[PDB]
Amino acid sequence: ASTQGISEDLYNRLVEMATISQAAYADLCNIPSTIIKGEKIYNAQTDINGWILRDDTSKEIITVFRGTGSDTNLQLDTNYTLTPFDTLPQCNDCEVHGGYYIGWISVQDQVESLVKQQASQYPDYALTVTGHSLGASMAALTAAQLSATYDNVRLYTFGEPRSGNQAFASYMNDAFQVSSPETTQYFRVTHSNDGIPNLPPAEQGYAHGGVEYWSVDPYSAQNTFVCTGDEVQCCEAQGGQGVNDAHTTYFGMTSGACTWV
Ligand SMILES: *[C@@H]1O[C@H](CO)[C@@H](O)[C@H](O)[C@H]1NC(C)=O
Ligand SMILES: COc1cc(/C=C/C(=O)O)ccc1O
Ligand SMILES: COc1cc(/C=C/C(=O)O)ccc1O
């Protein structure tokens, strides 16, 4: 289906996670007041940047990754070789985008130790992972690993590439209850004709998982669509090309601009 309209509560949640993702490009400018900032995640070889955060009000530990912000990150973006996802031996025949797998391995020990430290102290909190574009694929690989280790794992992505093959997409669909929009814990958000959700091309053995939430302009709850099933539809049907204007700006927030309250 491609169903018009979402609730005000869900729209507010998508805008909150988009704000965190776009603020990750400018040292977390103007993130919600309900959030305590924890340790920085960083690797010098890959230039992967992220943070661990905590929202006591909503009882969640949030991990965010920045998208592309350097020449080194652009090199990762264009390594389209599929690589076995050996992080999860139980993910049968799962393969991931080769550049993003290097990025994930380069920060894995930091992410896992910092998440363990928070989860051990707040064992009833949910774990949420988010990011934009390259940061969205970093979030997907991270959330897959956490889902095998913890309860109540959630994933909000914005302008996400195809992160791996169909086996990886179906593992995520099962682990995140994607079979209904009423149960999903994986919200794969897209905007208008963003070109990045069309890369790598599906013909190279790549696939998306999750429920797609497609924001059409002008943006609002009533002009966001819920997209499920195998038909080409929503953002992917628009056939946008590459890094374009729609890619940069989600719910009126441009990466790193700090124009939000
Ligand atoms: C692409 O990434 C994979 C790991 O996921 C790596 O083994 C391979 O050598 C990379 N390709 C290049 C050209 O660096
Ligand atoms: C998956 O393919 C690509 C992804 C990006 C990501 C851009 C960003 O994080 O801004 C750029 C070029 C690509 O070919
Ligand atoms: C030009 O102004 C508008 C256009 C739309 C169109 C919605 C769509 O076709 O999906 C919605 C609200 C507006 O204020």
Nearest residue by C-alpha to atom 2 in ligand 1 = 98
How far apart, in whole angstroms, are the C-alpha atoms of residue 34 and residue 62? 12
Pairing mode, strands 253-254 and 249-250: antiparallel
Is 97 an active-site residue?
no
Per DSSP, the residues of 238-253 read H---SS-HHHHEETTE
Give the tokens for residue 254.
């441009």
DSSP count for the chain of H helices, then E strands:
7, 13
Range list of β-strands (E), the chain: 2-4, 35-43, 48-55, 60-65, 82-84, 95-97, 126-132, 153-158, 186-191, 211-215, 224-227, 249-250, 253-254
Number of domains in the chain: 1
Give the tokens for residue 119.
């989860």
For ligand 2, is residue 212 a contact (CB within 6 Å)? no
How far apart, in whole angstroms, are the C-alpha atoms of residue 38 and residue 110? 12
First CA to last CA across the chain, in angstroms?
35
E strand or H helix at 136: helix 134-147
Contact 113, 119 (CB under 8 A): no
Is 80 assigned to a binding site?
Answer: yes
Give the tokens for residue 251.
């719910």
How far apart, in whole angstroms, are the C-alpha atoms of residue 148 and residue 140? 13
The domain that holds 124 is classified in CATH as 3.40.50.1820
Contact 130, 139 (CB under 8 A): yes
How far apart, in whole angstroms, are the C-alpha atoms of residue 113 and residue 115? 6
Is 213 assigned to a binding site?
Answer: no
Range of the domain at 51: 1-261
For ligand 2, is residue 141 a contact (CB within 6 Å)? no
Resolution of this structure in Å: 1.1
What is the DSSP code (8-state) at residue 207?
A: B
